[PDB]
From a paper:
JE-5C revealed a highly similar footprint with the classical Class 1 antibody, and JH-8B revealed a slightly shifted one with extension on the internal side but shrinkage on the outer side. The interaction is majorly contributed by its VH domain, of which the short HCDR1 loop (residue 26–33, Kabat numbering) clings along the RBD tip region, making hydrogen bonds with the highly conserved G476 and N487. An aromatic residue at the C-terminus of HCDR1, Y33, connects to the 453–456 loop by interacting with the carbonyl oxygen of L455 and packing with F456, which further extends in both sides to involve Y473 of RBD and Y52 on HCDR2 of JE-5C, forming a four-ring hydrophobic core. An even more extensive interaction network is employed by HCDR2, involving almost all its residues (Y52, S53, G54, G55 and S56) to make hydrogen bonds with the side chains of T415, K417, D420 and Y421, as well as the backbone of R457. Such a binding mode pulls the entire VH domain close to the 457–460 and 415–421 loops of RBD, and the corresponding residues are mostly conserved in earlier lineages except for K417 which has been mutated to N since the emergence of Beta variant. Particularly, the N460K mutation would place the Cε atom of K in an unfavorably close distance with both Oγ of S56 and carbonyl oxygen of G55. To avoid this, the whole HCDR2 loop may possibly be lifted, thus compromising other beneficial contacts and resulting in the reduced neutralization potency (> 20 times lower in IC50 from BA.5 to BQ.1.1). The HCDR3 of JE-5C recognizes mainly the RBD ridge: R94 interacts with N487 in cooperation with G26 from HCDR1; the hydrophobic L96 and A99 are in ~3.5-5Å distance from the highly conserved Y489; R97 is close to K417 but may prefer to N417 in the later variants; and E98 makes a hydrogen bond with Y453. And the LCDRs contribute even less, contacting only R403 and Y505. Hotspot mutations such as D405N, R408S, F486V/P, Q493R, and Y505H do not appear to affect the binding of JE-5C.
Author numbering:
A (entry chain L): 1 to 66, 68 to 210
B (entry chain H): 1 to 82, 82A, 82B, 82C, 83 to 100, 100A, 100E, 101 to 128, ...
C (entry chain E): 334 to 518, 521 to 528
The structure:
């Protein structure tokens, strides 16, 4: 059994720069190494096969070499992924450890929007408000809920998405989940956000109508 | 025409059995090296098994005496019988055609996640994130709350709106169930004119729902 | 009259693995004394007979197959073993009464620039039958579209060339093989006489 130790996944290169992913193995097989690109949330696509040969489609920015190396000539926004290396050794076809490429860019402010609870949701007995922060960089953002100009620490939940393949900007959504009754006793709901690219926090409020 | 469509199970509970499928298009299973490769929820690929063309089976050591690959060229499908299923076996499973020294796994499937846990299936409840507010307005979206197991897939207008769509990853609610939100950003001029249906599907619960987000009032 | 073992072992060039060369050996006195006494062999597997009394045994009919593979694939030259070589190039019968002799050969079967003349079979719709030799170059139809002799997607050449280079690793260096089928089914290949 072979052990291919790829390079670390903290790659924060810029647009138009380069990547150099190295895949060292335990017992070296010759010309029998494949490179793949698992785009964020998709099935792996093949890029390099037989250590260096390119596949029909793969741009001329991708390259390989025969303990092994992977290289991108001019890093483009599309190339956000986790790059694995494969090897035909002896059943098992051992994979890599996954080298994640992360494209860096200028600062960017989020487009913060507020969504009140659904009318049809209240008949279930739970009222949850959604706060959407879209298109921002970096991921460092603080989403603070405020009900009757107080605070909420417990009902809050968050989920952020990977960088986009076109603008390399993160997007996050915050949810404040409360019961039907606890919801009706308060007439001010808002999510206040703080980001490096927004000089001052932007409070988006709604008063149940 | 090339396509590797996968028909797999979602939940089986520990000590159970399942059977995956790999419906092919653009290739032929009976005359090709076909292999299965799974990605556990830890963003790491792992080789599972292969069948070759002439019928020689090779499996990884972790799934040696439990799993089995079969094929039927009658329907040109590939299967993976997962008997004596465990717990770490939770992963999204992909089938591929490994041409080895003439290309390597050129064509891939799309992914059918297998979750193993003693819990039971739970269907979702798709509530709408209504559009409100000019210039900058609250966009449209829909909340897929309270479901189990993973995953759910949200599409818009059957597949013709795929621009500013940010289907966020799932969060594990305090009730052990999952929830997530899919939001799309579209121009304000088209909200009243366009139709907005978020197509949600949670196969482990057979739930296929289409909610209709329409602008509200303020 | 001594069986011409040297004619096979010390031959100039061996055939490719897919088109392996079989030499029928009969009507002669067997001389396995030269075989075990060499210490130049990497692998010496003898099934049914032990490499000690071989020189003092009689045999009805004997076949001596030979070819060249890479180092890693030498293990697959065994009754029951499977892979790309034991299934698409050279399969041994599951009742193999004989020997599987093999030795390194990076000096002979490696050209300074890289010898790309030894070829194996990569794609084949089915496994080989015991002692089968597929000398077909029909472009492999890896789909449902007819290739009609043309190359392209799902239209691959069923034979790939061994990248035999002197820099290759041990597993990727050419190892010459000679497989002696010893007995089956008159008699002539004897030892004591
Ligand atoms: C091959 O030649 C050597 C001399 O270098 C000889 O000793 C040996 O017997 C020959 N091989 C056979 C099978 O006779």
């Amino acid at each position: 059994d072979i052990v291919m130790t790829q390079s670390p996944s903290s790659l924060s290169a810029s647009v138009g720069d380069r990547v150099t992913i190295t895949c060292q193995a335990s017992q070296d097989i010759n010309n029998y190494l494949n490179w793949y690109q698992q785009k964020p949330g998709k099935a792996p696509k093949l890029l390099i096969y037989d250590a260096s040969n390119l596949e029909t489609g793969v741009p001329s920015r991708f390259s390989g070499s025969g303990d092994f190396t992977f290289t991108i000539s001019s890093l483009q926004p599309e190339d956000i992924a986790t790059y694995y290396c494969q090897q035909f050794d002896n059943l098992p076809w051992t994979f890599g450890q996954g080298t994640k490429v992360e494209i860096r860019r200028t600062v960017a402010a989020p487009s913060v929007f507020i969504f009140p609870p659904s009318d049809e949701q209240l008949k279930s007995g739970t009222a949850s408000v959604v706060c959407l922060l879209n298109n921002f960089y970096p991921r460092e953002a603080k989403v603070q809920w405020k009900v009757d100009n107080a605070l909420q620490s417990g009902n809050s939940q968050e989920s952020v998405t990977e960088q986009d393949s076109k603008d390399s900007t993160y997007s996050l959504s915050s949810t404040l989940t409360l019961s039907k009754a606890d919801y009706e006793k308060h007439k001010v709901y808002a999510c206040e956000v703080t980001h490096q690219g927004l000089s001052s926090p932007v409070t988006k409020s709604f008063n149940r109508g | 025409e090339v396509q590797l469509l996968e028909s797999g199970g979602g939940l089986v509970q520990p000590g159970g059995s399942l059977r995956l499928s790999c419906a092919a298009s653009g290739v032929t299973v009976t005359s090709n090296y076909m292999s299965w490769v799974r990605q556990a929820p830890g963003k790491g690929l792992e080789w599972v098994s292969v069948i070759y063309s002439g019928g020689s089976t090779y499996y990884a050591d972790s799934v040696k005496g439990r799993f089995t690959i079969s094929r039927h060229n009658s329907k040109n499908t590939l299967y993976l019988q997962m008997n004596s299923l465990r717990a770490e076996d939770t992963a999204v499973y992909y089938c591929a055609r490994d041409l080895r020294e003439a290309g390597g796994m050129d064509v891939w499937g799309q992914g059918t996640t297998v979750t193993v846990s003693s819990a039971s299936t739970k269907g979702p409840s798709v509530f709408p994130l209504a559009p409100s507010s000019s210039g900058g307005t609250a966009a449209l979206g829909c909340l897929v709350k309270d479901y189990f197991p993973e995953p759910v897939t949200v599409s818009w207008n059957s597949g013709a709106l795929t621009s500013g769509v940010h289907t966020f990853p799932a969060v594990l609610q305090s009730s052990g169930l999952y929830s997530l939100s899919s939001v799309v950003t579209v121009p304000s001029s088209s909200l009243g004119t366009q139709t907005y249906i978020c197509n949600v599907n949670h196969k482990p619960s057979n739930t296929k729902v289409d909610k209709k987000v329409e602008p509200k009032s303020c | 009259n001594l069986c011409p073992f040297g004619e096979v072992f010390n031959a100039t060039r061996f055939a490719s693995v897919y088109a392996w060369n079989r030499k029928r050996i009969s009507n002669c006195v067997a001389d396995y004394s030269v075989l075990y006494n060499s210490a130049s062999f990497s692998t010496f597997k003898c099934y049914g007979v032990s490499p000690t009394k071989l020189n003092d045994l009689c045999f009805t009919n004997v076949y001596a197959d030979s070819f060249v593979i890479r180092g890693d694939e030498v293990r697959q030259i065994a009754p029951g073993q499977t892979g790309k070589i034991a299934d698409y190039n050279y399969k041994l019968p599951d009742d193999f009464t004989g020997c599987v002799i093999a030795w390194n050969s990076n000096n002979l079967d490696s050209k300074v620039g890289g010898n790309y003349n030894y070829l194996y079979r990569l794609f084949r719709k089915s496994n080989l039958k015991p002692f089968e030799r597929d000398i077909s170059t029909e472009i492999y139809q890896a789909g449902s579209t007819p290739c009609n002799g043309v190359e392209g997607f799902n239209c691959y050449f069923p034979l790939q060339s061994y990248g035999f280079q002197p820099t290759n690793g041990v597993g990727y260096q050419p190892y010459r093989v000679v497989v002696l089928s010893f007995e089956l089914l008159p008699a002539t290949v004897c030892g004591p006489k």
